[PDB]
Amino acid sequence: FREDCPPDREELGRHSWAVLHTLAAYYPDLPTPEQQQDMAQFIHLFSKFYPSEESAEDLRKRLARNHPDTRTRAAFTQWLCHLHNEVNRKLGKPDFDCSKVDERWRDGWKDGSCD
Amino acid sequence: FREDCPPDREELGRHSWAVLHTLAAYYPDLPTPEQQQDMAQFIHLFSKFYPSEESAEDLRKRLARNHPDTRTRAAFTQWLCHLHNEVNRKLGKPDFDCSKVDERWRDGWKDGSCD
Ligand SMILES: Cc1cc2nc3c(=O)[nH]c(=O)nc-3n(C[C@H](O)[C@H](O)[C@H](O)COP(=O)(O)OP(=O)(O)OC[C@H]3O[C@@H](n4cnc5c(N)ncnc54)[C@H](O)[C@@H]3O)c2cc1C
Ligand SMILES: Cc1cc2nc3c(=O)[nH]c(=O)nc-3n(C[C@H](O)[C@H](O)[C@H](O)COP(=O)(O)OP(=O)(O)OC[C@H]3O[C@@H](n4cnc5c(N)ncnc54)[C@H](O)[C@@H]3O)c2cc1C
Numbered sequence: 001f002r003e004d005c006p007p008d009r010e011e012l013g014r015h016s017w018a019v020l021h022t023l024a025a026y027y028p029d030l031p032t033p034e035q036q037q038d039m040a041q042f043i044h045l046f047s048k049f050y051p052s053e054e055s056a057e058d059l060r061k062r063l064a065r066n067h068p069d070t071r072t073r074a075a076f077t078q079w080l081c082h083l084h085n086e087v088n089r090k091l092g093k094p095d096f097d098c099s100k101v102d103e104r105w106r107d108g109w110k111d112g113s114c115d
Numbered sequence: 116f117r118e119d120c121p122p123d124r125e126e127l128g129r130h131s132w133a134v135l136h137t138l139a140a141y142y143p144d145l146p147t148p149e150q151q152q153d154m155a156q157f158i159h160l161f162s163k164f165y166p167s168e169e170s171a172e173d174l175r176k177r178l179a180r181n182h183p184d185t186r187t188r189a190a191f192t193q194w195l196c197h198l199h200n201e202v203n204r205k206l207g208k209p210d211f212d213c214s215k216v217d218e219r220w221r222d223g224w225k226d227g228s229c230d
Contacts (some may be wrong), residue, residue: 005229006140006220007133016132022127026166042160045153051141105121114120 009052016050017084024077025106031070039070062086077101131165132199139192140221146185152188154185177201192216 007015015110020043028035030039047063052057062083081098096104108114122130135158143150162178177198178216184194197215209210211219223229 002224002228004189004219005223007137012133012137015130018122018127018130019134020124022130022166023164025121027164038160038163041156042164045157045160048153049138049142049157051137062140104119109117113117 009055012051013055020046020080021077021084021101021105024073024080025102027070027073027076029073031072036070040068041077043068058090059087077105124170127166128170135161135195136192136199136216136220139188140197142185142188142191144188146187151185154191155183158183173205174202178203192220 028064031039041079044063047056047059050059066083069075078098078101081096081101085095085098103109126176138157146154159178162171162174165174181198184190193213193216196211196216198208200213218224
């Protein structure tokens with residue numbers, strides 16, 4: 001019944017997706033070369049530190065075969081959603097509909113339910 | 116009443132501290148030069164992308180005056196806790212007792228309440 005405990009696999013995963021999908025969602029539509037390199041390095045280093053040894057190792061391999069597209073906010077947000085669906089599929093979870101990433105992570109549901 | 120909405124300032128902040136304090140907590144006790152450089156760069160780039168413009172700008176300045184100590188897991192976990200207390204103080208929040216960072220973010224309360 002305590003909420004101030006060390007996040008387990010699932011809780012840390014939920015926090016980490018929230019972070020990553022939020023950062024993606026406010027990444028520029030026209031990022032500078034520096035911002036593109038910087039964001040590719042961010043996700044690279046994040047993968048180096050992600051503390052679940054199983055989780056992080058699959059993620060490093062998954063990224064070796066699938067480099068972050070940081071060209072634009074659109075490409076990077078979709079890329080990240082496609083990355084997340086790969087882990088969802090791994091875990092038996094359904095795909096998240098990536099045409100929804102903007103509503104979910106930046107703008108809110110179009111029907112108004114986050115108001 | 117929806118939990119799948121875009122995190123506001125406070126929710127993203129809570130996710131982001133969870134991430135950062137969890138990553139810190141599993142950082143090596145004897146990190147290699149590479150791991151030290153990599154973690155200093157991670158926090159640097161994180162500060163570049165943190166999407167609250169006010170929040171992120173204070174954080175970049177706060178880091179210019181206070182560079183991440185990534186020498187060891189102990190120094191980095193304490194450093195991060197001291198960084199977090201600076202934001203808590205800014206916001207009128209009490210200091211978190213940094214001798215507790217291990218219980219809170221890795222091992223669980225010593226009294227057994229995360230079991
Ligand atoms: C980088 C990373 C790698 C991980 N690797 C593993 C692993 O190898 N093995 C393992 O057991 N766990 C892994 N996890 C943890 C795992 O993915 C989940 O976070 C955890 O299992 C809790 O799942 P959940 O059902 O609450 O939803 P989560 O998968 O945590 O998703 C959180 C929320 O994000 C939204 N969402 C879901 N999919 C997408 C999408 N594709 N795009 C945009 N938004 C989405 C939904 O609103 C959902 O409620 C990993 C987590 C991360 C961040
Ligand atoms: C890097 C960063 C910079 C931010 N800058 C601003 C800003 O400039 N202005 C603004 O309004 N908001 C800022 N925020 C958001 C803000 O700090 C809080 O996250 C948010 O206000 C919600 O606060 P909270 O009371 O739920 O606890 P949080 O501050 O979100 O803390 C979450 C939990 O962490 C634990 N904790 C608290 N302090 C520490 C500590 N020092 N060390 C270890 N664990 C701790 C406690 O268990 C607490 O419940 C920032 C967030 C981050 C991650």
